[PDB]
């Protein structure tokens, strides 16, 4: 008959239900002992996908009408900002909705209560001044570079047997990236072949193509040629390419498409390595790296093109054949390569590096971090309980509810571990209350322990953005009472 | 039929439903501007009954199968010990059940949570000590004797125009009681007569019975005779003793009646047993059996027994008891719905402040006690280990509703009230509380409203044990209306 | 949004039902006494098919909605390593699910229980150390080459009267193949027409194709040509003809094998030359054969002489009781050989195809491992006695999960006895007393109805079959229970 209409308490309920459904699935995926989840869907799915990253799975699908997709969409902007470690920001937003049950008892104006969000700003910043944070990584740093936050991101993920080693590698990659440049030229790829190292580092850019079985194994003081057009009377074509080639000393040719067979015989004898159907996206990054070139007709060699002469070679990774470009003069652009166990757990690493590279970039800019494993959450909770009573009252109603929202974070960490959640809460509050910031939830123990020995740390950046953002994501939904007058029909 | 057994959610549900149904009706009653309700029942009641006092209506009727009657039955023992004034204890027990729906999320063991009840006992003792109570009320006292708690008990009642004066009088009655002997021998009745005072204080015991048309009008240096067995030998035993009055708890045979008139002895036909039992303690007692009962077996006090006119109608008074352990109270009323209410109020008044001289401790009224207690209970949950804390912290916000109910009956918006209330209590001023006449927060002490320390200690334990018996135990349930 | 969302208990139920549904049909299959079972379906299913192999029927059809096909698919990779014996891996994986009902009562994180599988690895390798393991195959081996495990694999099979004889033959085949990296070029099929042997051994590799009715009847010291590209105005055609004849002649070419369609013109040429060619030869046959011959490089018609490697002994078309088949033989390599099965002509004949897969993998393993364990469930009861101690030994959560895994082993003795035709209850306790005492040889005797000496029977299971099954069962069960979501992901 018309538009979707909900009034008073019913409008509140739709938002309320969406938050509870998401929280139970996400809880098992938090901190150093999370659970892998496999998802099955019909049509245009073709099977099951398993994601250990909460943000990636929510973005992909809009299962039903109940509002949550827009809230979910927001987490990605956060991902660019800092994004991860462990997924948990979504869970905290969900918790605040449980409170609205006691609100009906309040019975007057729900938006006056919204002052809690005003309060949230005051409560949020008490964690952004208080704690113990850390002494931030000064720059490059020999051993404080990793085996810390990256490991924690990994710990919720099972592959952390071989994988924690990979995580250690990521900081080295960020160090070259470090300073004023921001994020550019990082694409990193993985393979179906297993090796103990499970990762190779490249000075320049990494591809995955071979000229053919024949051709010189290694090229040095290399000249690089990039052609927009394909190589696809015939002898005349052959000759133009060879005469221009020999004078230059051309060491490598890269073409973004199919390549005609005659050129291939020529390149092998000359001592020149060529690449068939190189993807266009890889090529654009390479141009910035080598100083660039103008890609025209076979006239394209000589001065219309600029070449970087350090080291280009093709080596066998272990199973799959790849080609290594390195020693770029520009230095601005670099490439990371990962190896793995070989199943799906490995593809997880594909998921992990994208998340890991950006967080580290923020780590150098922030120069501040906080203890992980929920150590940060309990300390703040002790401080916030005191605050509600102290404020006059309108302020107090609002302030106290926010404070108890912090409490199940310890619970969520412990619950996914496989230990009794209430028991965990009892011991945890006492250690934080005493004054030890290092102490936190230890999932491996089943109780609590020293977070620092683990080396688990969370970026200072994740805590400031979540606190301000959580209030805003929750506030929009709660602030508006009754939604009516819309449907197209 | 017969016995029943209960399953997971349904068992909890039966207890859960009982608490919510009773909370709403009792809710209007609390506070100075509470309102009366009238109930009619299924053929054993005879008519419409209106009771301002929450406890009286619940005791009289066992409406349905759900566990509530045993919870309800307990409130009267509380009344005996102290719990009266305004009904609040039942309300307090009832919202603890709401927390249980939240508790389903708490997937572990509900009984573990139960450990919270003596944690709560710690909370009761945490509450007691941590809250400035009072330092006044030395004994008898010129002005702190009342114009305090009785007035608040009365405040929830409309009568408080002429009636607040009556409440002040109640303390004089306790003043004569203080000493060694306990709380006993208090009886109150009302009469048809208009007066601004609306009461008189009487020294002796009030009774209203007469032997017959003939007999001496007044007896002097009276001896009292009590017989367990009915009249349905007497002169010979009587003359030697010098008996002046005979009291029998039952029907009296006609033949002896002629004898008593000529002798000059006043007898009482069908005297009620409750007055008689008290009397035995009063007169030194007697051994009540068959007609052998006279002389030494019985002891009789002997000041004066006479029939006196009390303003209007004629009444008989027993006074001048040698023992000194028992007394009686008589009230005269203008007549209205609220005067026999004094029956309700005096019974309650006696327990509230007799207790007050014994305690030497009281707390500020008008909800001053509840917000302060709420302020310090929140810290305590955090102070205690965390799973203990989860149960303890839920208890702490429970106290929040009392401030809201006090204000709500006043006529002022509840949201604003909660807000202004907490800031004054948090600051450290115990005297400050909810001033309903203001609609805001004010000085409770100026009002003169104070609560007996026992009402607060006793309510806490009574609520804890009563709440504990629910969540714990199965065997009940509810079905359909009327 | 056709996504399937499963909730805690419901999530177990889909999988729980899938495990129970498959368990009953597979159960009758195990032991010396088994049930044949045939299935009929509408739409591109002309007639009933009989499966004495739990694995074969499960792979062919994905009958219902509930997840189990991937679990089912996995059993075949097992088949490559060891496979057969009797179908027990699926049964054991399913039995673990039934005590999960007990787990709801426990009412804690289900994943905590998962520690039992790690516990299972301990149990899995104690299937080792609890065996004195035969002592010495001695490679090749005179008398105990077979009349052992193959017989057990076939004991459940209906054909055990005549067929136990062909099972015996299978080990001779493995002996030829020694250099025990299981199988290269081992291809055997069932053939029509009866014989007492019900099987024949060919020194070479079989096939089922002919060039044409005309051509020389047979070839000697034959050279083999294999072409990737097909043989597929007249004067232009003749040149194509000439290239093929001019260089074919120098070699002395006796046989040509091409995988795909063959052009008609060369066919006349081959007959006069004295060369036998094969039209549309199957690719799978061709490279295994190539391993046998010495591996050629297949290019364009330049392919003759050296770029082709031809082994020469005897290539001929030989009448085999029935039809008439093409046989390649006398391979120099010796590494790869072919066994040809024959039968009366029974659906049960199709049994041999199953049996073959079963025969090849276990025997190859038996020679490399030089270790094996007693069959008939001897291994299973002994392991069960040890695991009971483990449950009591470990505190709290670990004992509950370890204990449940331990009782799972108890059911296998019951299934072994149940298919026998004897009372299962009596069998279980008598069995436990002999294993507890310390006799590894003692085990379930299905014909006996009671417990007996397994070694006399000759039934033994490869050391690999026991270590891998136990690890595999754990992983198969873990993929479901371990993960509590199963929802969303795919734009639409």
Domain boundaries along the sequence of chain C: 1-133+371-492, 134-202+335-370, 203-334
Q: B385–A427: do the CB atoms touch at under 8 Å?
A: yes
Q: Which of C341, C363, C362 is nearest to C351 (CA)?
A: C341
Radius of gyration for the alpha carbons in chain C, expressed in angstroms and rounded: 27
Answer CATH for A1-133+368-489 from 3.90.180.10, 1.10.560.10, 3.30.1540.20, 3.40.50.300: 1.10.560.10
How far apart (Å, rounded) are the C-alpha atoms in residues C276 and C257?
9
How far apart (Å, rounded) are the C-alpha atoms in residues B243 and C124?
105
Q: How far is CA B461 from CA A61, B397, B457, C52, in A?
A: 54, 18, 7, 74
Q: Is the distance from CB of A71 to CB of A93 less than 8 angstroms?
A: yes
How far apart (Å, rounded) are the C-alpha atoms in residues C281 and C286?
7
Q: How many CA atoms lie within 13 A of C203 on its CB side?
A: 10
Chain C residues with CB-CB distance to A64 below 8 A: 1
Start-to-end CA span in chain A (Å): 8
Q: A394–B401: do the CB atoms touch at under 8 Å?
A: no
CATH number of C134-202+335-370: 3.30.260.10
CATH number of A203-331: 3.50.7.10
Closest by Cβ to A49, choosing from C2, C112, C489: C489
Residues whose CB is less than 8 angstroms from the CB of residue A36 and which lie 6 or more positions away in sequence, other chains included: A50, A52, A157, A158, C482, C483
Q: Crossing angle of helices C463-478/C351-369, nearest 10°?
A: 110
Q: Which of A203, A313, A295 is nearest to A252 (CA)?
A: A313
Determine the topology of domain B1-133+361-482 in CATH: GROEL; domain 1 (1.10.560)
Q: Does domain C203-334 have CATH number 3.50.7.10?
A: yes
Closest by Cβ to A390, choosing from B382, B415, B426: B426
Q: Is the distance from CB of C321 to CB of C193 less than 8 angstroms?
A: yes
Which chains lie within 8 Å of chain A at 3 or more CB pairs, if any?
B, C
Chain B residues with CB-CB distance to A421 below 8 A: 107-108
Answer CATH for B203-324 from 3.30.70.1290, 3.50.7.10, 3.40.109.10, 3.40.50.170: 3.50.7.10
SS3 assignment, position A182: coil
- A320 at the C interface (CB within 8 A)? no
Q: B386–A428: do the CB atoms touch at under 8 Å?
A: yes
Q: In the PDB record, what is the listed experimental method?
A: cryo-EM
B451 backbone dihedrals φ, ψ, rounded to 5°: -115, 140
Chain A residues with CB-CB distance to B385 below 8 A: 426-427, 429-430
CATH class of A134-202+332-367: alpha beta
A14-20 long-range CB contacts below 8 Å, 24 or more apart? Answer: A14/A66, A14/A67, A15/A67, A15/A97, A15/A477, A15/A478, A16/A97, A16/A100, A17/A66, A18/A66, A18/A67, A18/A68, A18/A71, A19/A68, A19/A93, A19/A94, A19/A95, A19/A97, A20/A94, A20/A97, A20/A98
Residue B265: exposure state from Cβ atoms within 10 A (0-12, 13-18, ≥19): buried
Q: Is the distance from CB of A187 to CB of A216 less than 8 angstroms?
A: no
B440 backbone dihedrals φ, ψ, rounded to 5°: -125, -165
A128-133 long-range CB contacts below 8 Å, 24 or more apart? Answer: A128/A463, A128/A464, A128/A467, A130/A379, A130/A380, A130/A383, A131/A370, A131/A371, A131/A376, A131/A379, A131/A380, A131/A437, A132/A371, A132/A437, A132/A438, A133/A368, A133/A369, A133/A370, A133/A460
Residue A410 CA from chain centroid, whole number: 23
- A63 at the C interface (CB within 8 A)? yes
Q: Quick one: tokens of C280?
A: 């549309």
Q: Is the distance from CB of A31 to CB of A440 less than 8 angstroms?
A: no
Min Cα distance A430 → chain B (Å) is 6
Radius of gyration for the alpha carbons in chain A, expressed in angstroms and rounded: 28
Q: Is C329 annotated as a binding residue?
A: no
Q: Of the residues A134, A145, A198, A355, which is catalytic?
A: A355
Resolution (A): 10.7
Rama region for B477: left / alpha / beta (φ>0; ψ in -120 to 50; rest): left
CATH class of C1-133+371-492: mainly alpha
Residues whose CB is less than 8 angstroms from the CB of residue B187 and which lie 6 or more positions away in sequence, other chains included: B205, B206, B275, B278, B328, B329
How far apart (Å, rounded) are the C-alpha atoms in residues C428 and B49?
75
Query: Least CA distance to A430: which residue of chain B?
Result: B385
Closest by Cβ to A35, choosing from C1, C111, C491: C111
How far apart (Å, rounded) are the C-alpha atoms in residues C284 and A95?
61
B314 backbone dihedrals φ, ψ, rounded to 5°: -95, 135
How far apart (Å, rounded) are the C-alpha atoms in residues C304 and C225?
7
DSSP E strands in B283-359: the ranges are 304-309, 314-319
Q: How far is CA A443 from CA B5, B387, C396, in A?
A: 40, 17, 17
The DSSP code for B95 is: G
Q: Is C472 annotated as a binding residue?
A: no
Within 10 angstroms of residue C436's Cβ, the number of other Cβ atoms is 13
CATH class of B134-202+325-360: alpha beta
């Amino acid at each position: 008959a018309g538009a979707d209409e909900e009034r008073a308490e019913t409008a509140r309920l739709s938002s309320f239900i969406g938050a509870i459904a998401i929280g139970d699935l996400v809880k098992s995926t938090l901190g150093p002992k999370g659970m892998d989840k496999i998802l099955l869907s019909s049509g245009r799915d073709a099977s099951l996908m398993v994601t250990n990253d909460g943000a990636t799975i929510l973005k992909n699908i809009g299962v039903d009408n109940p509002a949550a997709k827009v809230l979910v969409d927001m987490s990605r902007v956060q991902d660019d900002e800092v994004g991860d470690g462990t997924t948990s920001v979504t869970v905290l937003a969900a918790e605040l909705l449980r409170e609205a049950e006691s609100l009906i008892a309040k019975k007057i104006h729900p938006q006056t209560i919204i002052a809690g969000w005003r309060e949230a700003t005051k409560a949020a910043r008490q964690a952004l001044l208080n704690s113990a944070v850390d002494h931030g990584s000064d720059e490059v740093k020999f051993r404080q570079d990793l085996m810390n936050i990256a490991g924690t991101t990994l710990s919720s993920k099972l592959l952390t047997h071989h994988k924690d080693h990979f995580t250690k590698l990521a900081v080295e990659a960020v160090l070259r990236l470090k300073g004023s440049g921001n994020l550019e030229a990082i694409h990193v790829i993985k393979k179906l072949g297993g090796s103990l190292a499970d990762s190779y580092l490249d000075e320049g850019f990494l591809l995955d193509k071979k000229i053919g079985v024949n051709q010189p194994k290694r090229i040095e003081n290399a000249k690089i040629l990039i052609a927009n057009t394909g190589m696809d009377a015939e002898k005349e074509k052959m000759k133009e390419k060879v005469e221009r080639i020999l004078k230059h000393g051309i060491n490598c040719f890269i073409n973004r498409q199919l390549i005609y067979n005659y050129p291939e015989q020529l390149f092998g004898a000359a001592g020149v390595m060529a690449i068939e159907h190189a993807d266009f996206v890889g090529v654009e990054r390479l141009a910035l790296v080598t100083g660039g070139e103008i890609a025209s007709t076979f006239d394209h060699p000589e001065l219309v093109k600029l070449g970087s002469c350090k080291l280009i070679e093709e080596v066998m990774i272990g199973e799959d054949k790849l080609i290594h470009f390195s020693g770029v003069a520009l230095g601005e652009a670099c490439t990371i390569v990962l190896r793995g166990a070989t199943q799906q757990i490995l593809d997880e690493a594909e998921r992990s590096l994208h998340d890991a590279l950006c967080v580290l970039a923020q780590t150098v800019k922030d120069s501040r971090t906080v203890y992980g494993g929920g150590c940060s959450e309990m300390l703040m909770a002790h401080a916030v309980t005191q605050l509600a009573s102290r404020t006059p009252g309108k302020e107090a109603v609002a302030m106290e509810s926010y404070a108890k929202a912090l409490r199940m974070l310890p619970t969520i960490i412990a619950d996914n571990a496989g230990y009794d959640s209430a028991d965990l809460v009892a011991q945890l509050r006492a250690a934080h209350s005493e004054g030890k910031t290092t102490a936190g939830l230890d999932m491996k123990e089943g109780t609590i322990g020293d977070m620092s020995v683990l080396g688990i740390t969370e970026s200072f950046q994740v805590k400031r953005q979540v606190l301000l953002s959580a209030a805003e994501a929750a506030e929009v939904i709660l602030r508006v009472d009754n939604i009516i007058k819309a449907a197209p029909r």
